[PDB]
Design a protein around this ligand. Sequence first.
Ligand SMILES: NC(=O)c1ccc[n+]([C@@H]2O[C@H](COP(=O)([O-])OP(=O)(O)OC[C@H]3O[C@@H](n4cnc5c(N)ncnc54)[C@H](O)[C@@H]3O)[C@@H](O)[C@H]2O)c1
Ligand SMILES: NC(=O)c1ccc[n+]([C@@H]2O[C@H](COP(=O)([O-])OP(=O)(O)OC[C@H]3O[C@@H](n4cnc5c(N)ncnc54)[C@H](O)[C@@H]3O)[C@@H](O)[C@H]2O)c1
Lengths: 233, 233
Amino acid sequence: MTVLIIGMGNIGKKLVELGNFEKIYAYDRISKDIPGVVRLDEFQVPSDVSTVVECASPEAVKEYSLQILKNPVNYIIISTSAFADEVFRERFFSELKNSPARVFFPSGAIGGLDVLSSIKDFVKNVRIETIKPPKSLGLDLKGKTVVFEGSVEEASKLFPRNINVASTIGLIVGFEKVKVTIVADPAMDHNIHIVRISSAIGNYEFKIENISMLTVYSILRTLRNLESKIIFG
Amino acid sequence: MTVLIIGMGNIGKKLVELGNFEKIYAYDRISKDIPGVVRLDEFQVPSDVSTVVECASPEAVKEYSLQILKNPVNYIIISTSAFADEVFRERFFSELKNSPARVFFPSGAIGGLDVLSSIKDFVKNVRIETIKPPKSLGLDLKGKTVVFEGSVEEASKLFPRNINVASTIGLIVGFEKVKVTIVADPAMDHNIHIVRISSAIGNYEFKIENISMLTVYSILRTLRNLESKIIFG
Ligand SMILES: NC(=O)c1ccc[n+]([C@@H]2O[C@H](COP(=O)([O-])OP(=O)(O)OC[C@H]3O[C@@H](n4cnc5c(N)ncnc54)[C@H](O)[C@@H]3O)[C@@H](O)[C@H]2O)c1
Ligand SMILES: NC(=O)c1ccc[n+]([C@@H]2O[C@H](COP(=O)([O-])OP(=O)(O)OC[C@H]3O[C@@H](n4cnc5c(N)ncnc54)[C@H](O)[C@@H]3O)[C@@H](O)[C@H]2O)c1
């Protein structure tokens, strides 16, 4: 299929090298030498694009979402942190009911969204804890320390970085039901995600220790799935 | 859409009551009073069926898989334990390459299959441990005891019950890479599933404590997804 990739950062260039595409349109405010892509200069959704993939920034999701939705394409979004904004979220799904498009929210850096999606109406609450090494926060500590705790909306305001995982989760069960905790642990070599889910159907715990590659393959699997006979999860 | 549900056990009757369907064809060796379904007597795939759902038994998967695949429908399978059979597995995906159909393997009683599907080529091994209460095995114990450990193929031969979770997993990463452990813990009130995944991309831990309802909603979410604009995981 022909596709439009928004953003040529670590994830964009990676999709271009691993993906199998006849044609690739790419838009990125910068202008680095483009390899096997048709670097656009003015954003737009070419008529032969069957799928659009956003992997730029929350602001990009907000800037083009409206236009993208006019077109009858599969719309893959990863910068979900943008949905932590009540006003933008309302606007988006409005355009979507009228839209001929289809939106896909791949799990990204976490997993367990298959069951969380199935039992979403029954979820009582979701606790997502991120444990980063002190170094990655310019901190020197002798023990674990909570650097933040509250809603997804607030977490995004102070951490314009991640807060994408929690947002996709919020988009599934409702934001009011998600609590975010960011912990700095001097004993931690790498980043970790722990998703604790309480519901009327059962309780689930998902621990993620990524050694972001996971998100890349998460996108690829979604694209591959569009054209596959064997679908898992 | 019009659908064909194979098996009217706990899961079949549940799909009939919660599902939203214009027409339902149902086949079940028994003959209990059927409510809102068109109880067939001779198995077959009516021409107006757009989706078939198996939730009967592994033997059923093996008996009708061949026929189902001739038809251009979405084929949902849950009794995956049947794929632990090397010979049947080879036969199935053979028919599928030639098939106009599409197969869906919902996560069922576990979760985390979204990430496991994305990073499947990189998986080094998967350990799935099931911790049941001694009572559910007619055992009286004073401490945890392993009642079984080995491959998915063997687990199915001694436990014609579950071994479906491990099979779907085997279908994803390859059976040789899955190790199954069934533990009886006197301290355990309910059943638990722990899926430990080791790979080149990272390590994942999924703990599942279901209070099977999860599988039902897992099927429903797959059906709902066929006709939805918002897809998660
Ligand atoms: N959902 C998840 O699990 C998950 C995980 C990791 C990253 N992400 C998201 O992916 C994004 C980062 O991707 P990356 O790793 O390639 O980072 P990156 O910063 O290396 O790449 C971003 C690229 O997009 C371009 N860009 C920024 N705004 C743009 C805009 N408004 N319009 C067009 N182009 C724009 C930038 O010039 C940059 O080259 C982040 O926004 C993050 O939220 C999501
Ligand atoms: N993948 C998962 O996570 C998962 C989880 C739970 C159960 N399951 C599967 O679901 C099945 C059980 O479903 P249930 O909970 O409704 O159980 P059940 O035993 O109550 O229902 C099974 C029904 O299917 C009928 N049946 C059996 N063989 C048939 C055949 N060959 N052809 C036509 N009909 C047949 C039976 O008469 C019975 O009424 C099991 O085979 C199990 O492997 C999968």
